[PDB]
Amino acid sequence: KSYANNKEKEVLVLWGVHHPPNIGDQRALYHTENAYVSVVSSHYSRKFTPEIAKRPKVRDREGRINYYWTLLEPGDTIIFEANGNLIAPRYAFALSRGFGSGIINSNA
């Protein structure tokens, strides 16, 4: 899949990659034991070969999802490819920037 930014602003795109705890889950979910996810833009290009990893239960889940994001400047096109383990984007965020601020952590 591909999206071309025609919104004259930067588009924040987010996705994930699923690392199951067992191979049974891998087969049941995606029907391949050799999985790849490719994300490509002119300023971001990364590839994923997620392998099984059984992990301690967090929220009662031995598996994980690694979360990833990037900015897509106008005119540029982002391309996803996968045979499994992809958590595709559904909504993205067309934003203009702003500059020089921070985050506050208080109960006021």
């Epitope: 705890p21 067992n22 889950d25 049941a28 029907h31 889940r61």
Partner: antibody, heavy 126, light 108 residues
């Protein structure tokens, strides 16, 4: 109405082989697994495996790895269970099942068994 | 792994028949239950711990939690005398496992 119709009873002597058939009707034969489960006389259910008609991907249980061969055809909406090197303790009833219980969560993402065949009685005696 | 299921259970009509399916972390695996009357093939009665396929009386249900699942038959009748089996899918070994089964004896 979903229905699985299996082949007829078989009487074999040790060492022979069998090929049991399971012909499906009432749904698109390619959407769901075909599981195979046997039940020996008086004892309980023992799962043998599944084959997905669309991909041909197979899942064999450990006890049945190598002795058994699961296949399909798709054109006639039929799945096959071939057993080799038969022995008196292989005497049992062989059921096929449809993996049509679509999973509700990706936590337990398992296609459970909806519909069953009537069984195929296989007797192995010397 | 293994699923512990009591060999026999005795119950009187009009009562509530309660049956156990033992196992490790079975509460996160969502059990299914099959009814087998003698001379017939198995039949699905309870799916997903508490639910039913079309055509099953509402008095068939169940619960699942911790290390114990349970099938619950309210308002027991005589036509319910049969062998009951619980089944789960172990993702570790990628197997479908059954319990030893239970003979429900209705004292009529």
């Amino acid at each position: 109405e979903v229905q699985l119709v299996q082949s007829g009873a078989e009487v074999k002597k040790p060492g022979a082989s069998v090929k049991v058939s399971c012909k499906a009707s009432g749904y698109t034969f390619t959407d769901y697994h075909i599981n195979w489960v046997r039940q020996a006389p008086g004892q309980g259910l023992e799962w043998m495996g599944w084959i997905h008609p669309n991909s041909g991907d197979t899942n064999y249980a450990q006890k049945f790895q190598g002795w058994v061969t699961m296949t399909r055809d798709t054109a006639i909406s039929t799945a096959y269970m071939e057993v080799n090197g038969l022995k008196s303790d292989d005497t049992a009833v062989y059921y096929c099942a449809r993996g049509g219980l679509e999973p509700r969560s990706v936590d337990y993402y398992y296609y459970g068994m909806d519909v069953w065949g009537q069984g195929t009685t296989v007797t192995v005696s010397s | 792994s293994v699923l512990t299921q009591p060999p026999s259970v005795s119950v009187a009509p009009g009562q509530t028949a309660r049956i156990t399916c033992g196992g490790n972390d079975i509460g996160r695996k969502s059990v299914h239950w099959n009814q087998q009357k003698p001379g017939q093939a198995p039949v699905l009665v309870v799916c997903y711990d508490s639910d039913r396929p079309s055509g099953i009386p509402e008095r068939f249900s169940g619960s699942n939690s911790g290390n114990t699942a349970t099938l619950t038959i309210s308002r027991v009748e005589a036509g319910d005398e049969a062998d009951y089996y619980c089944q789960v899918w172990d993702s570790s070994s990628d197997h479908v496992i059954f319990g030893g089964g239970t003979k429900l004896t209705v004292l009529g």
